[PDB]
Amino acid sequence: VVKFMDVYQRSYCHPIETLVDIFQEYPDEIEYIFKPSCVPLMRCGGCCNDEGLECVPTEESNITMQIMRIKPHQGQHIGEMSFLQHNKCECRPKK
Amino acid sequence: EVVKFMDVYQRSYCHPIETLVDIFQEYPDEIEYIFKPSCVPLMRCGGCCNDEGLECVPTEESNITMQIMRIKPHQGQHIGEMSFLQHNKCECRPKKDRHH
Amino acid sequence: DIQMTQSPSSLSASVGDRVTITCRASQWIGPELKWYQQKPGKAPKLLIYHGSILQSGVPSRFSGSGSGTDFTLTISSLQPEDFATYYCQQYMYYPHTFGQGTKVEIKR
Amino acid sequence: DIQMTQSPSSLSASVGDRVTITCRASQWIGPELKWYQQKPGKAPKLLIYHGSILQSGVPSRFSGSGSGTDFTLTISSLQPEDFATYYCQQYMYYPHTFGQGTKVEIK
């Protein structure tokens, strides 16, 4: 059994490795298929346990990954793509 | 530096990953209590199979027990044991949808 | 009941000084701690909740830090209207419990 | 280009026997490997893709395994119709290279 305290601490608003579809982060380019189709990024996750608060990023940075870009039939190539990640997260009020 | 292609693939390829799941989703029937924490950390199937016809799904499941504070607002609370579903193994299985 | 040990009981300070009040919880309460300002003949005024988040309309010279068992209220630069008694309150478990308060007095 | 090395080159087996065929890739190709059955003067039939997933309508006695560099195709109980040549193909990198093939023969 996991103690309530550790449950709370572990699920409290923080940066957590999250698997994000590339088409979300780049919905303008439908020409290419991406591979892999999803990447692992640190993003804000968790609960604040207050109805009027919400978990939000307060420090950001860019990370760069090699992704295969696939033109359906013509060909493919591995280039660099940059993605947003979250370095620090905070419970802040909604409005 | 720059995450090499092979590593991006392997780390994103389908597997069980710690995921933050809202309790009200896992128990949408319960009406009187409010839960603290409102969300829990559970190993769950996540990531991409890299094939439109395949999807990632659990092949091995289990249960884990956690202490969750159950609050009747303005009245009181108790710390109650609650069990949640986990995913131990994930595999890329073909979808049920008709082939496109 | 969760016991809140506030300290110190009483301070003397001059306008402009930096003031540091502490509050200890007998048991873990996460970040769920509020700080109140209390002046004669008024109801207590909420300054800070969730440990560190300022209430709307509260000067930025008030800050709060800590999580779990040990907490701190800081006033970066004391102003005349800041002389008062300050209290902590945990709201993790019912019943919500208070510190005994810190009385912030003018130096003579 | 990825080099696919398939073994054995040929093999003789009896009906009912279990048959095992291997492919090695020269570098990591993930799970993205197909297995084809090719009979003389016909179209190659896709048996398995993504390393271990049966194409629809392929009997269950066919199975696949592996990820990375080392893969295996197993036929649990051999049938007269299964005597053919079997090819592995990788589809991680273009061009999609093949293995030399393995001929499964009657005793």
Numbering used by the authors:
A (entry chain V): 14 to 108
B (entry chain W): 13 to 112
C (entry chain L): 1 to 108
D (entry chain M): 1 to 107
How did the manuscript describe this experimental structure?
The various VEGF-A isoforms are all active as homodimers, differing principally in their size and their ability to bind heparin or accessory proteins called neuropilins. Domain antibodies are the smallest (11–15 kDa) antigen binding fragments of immunoglobulins. We have developed the dual dAb architecture using VEGF dAbs fused to human IgG1 domain and demonstrated high affinity binding of VEGF dual dAb to human, mouse, rabbit, and pig VEGF. The VEGF dual dAb is unique in its ability to sequester two VEGF dimers per molecule, most likely by a “side-on” engagement mechanism, whereas other common VEGF inhibitors only engage with VEGF in multiples of a 1:1 interaction.
A more detailed view of interface between dAbs and VEGF1–107 shows that Vκ·dAb interactions with VEGF are concentrated on complementarity determining regions, whereas the framework of VH·dAb is also involved in the paratope. The N-terminal Cα atoms of the Vκ·dAbs (these present at the C-terminal junction of the Fc region with the dAb in the full-length VEGF dual dAb) in the co-crystal structure are ∼70 Å apart. Orientating the N-terminal residues of the dAbs against the C-terminal linkers of VEGF dual dAb shows that the distance between the C-terminal residues can easily span the distance to enable them to attach to the dAbs when bound to VEGF. Such binding could explain one of the peaks in the SEC-MALLS analysis at high ratios of dual dAb-VEGF. When considering the end-on mode of engagement, in silico modeling studies demonstrate that it is highly unlikely that the two VH·dAbs at the N terminus of VEGF dual dAb could bind simultaneously to a single VEGF dimer, although it is possible for the Vκ·dAbs at the C terminus to do so (2:1 and 4:1 input molar ratios of dual dAb-VEGF). The top half showed reduced affinity, largely due to a more rapid dissociation rate, whereas the bottom half showed very similar VEGF affinity to the full VEGF dual dAb (data not shown). The N-terminal Cα atom of the Vκ·dAb in the co-crystal structure and the C-terminal Cα atom of the VH·dAb on the opposite VEGF epitope in the co-crystal structure, when the structures are superimposed based on the VEGF molecules, are ∼77 Å apart.
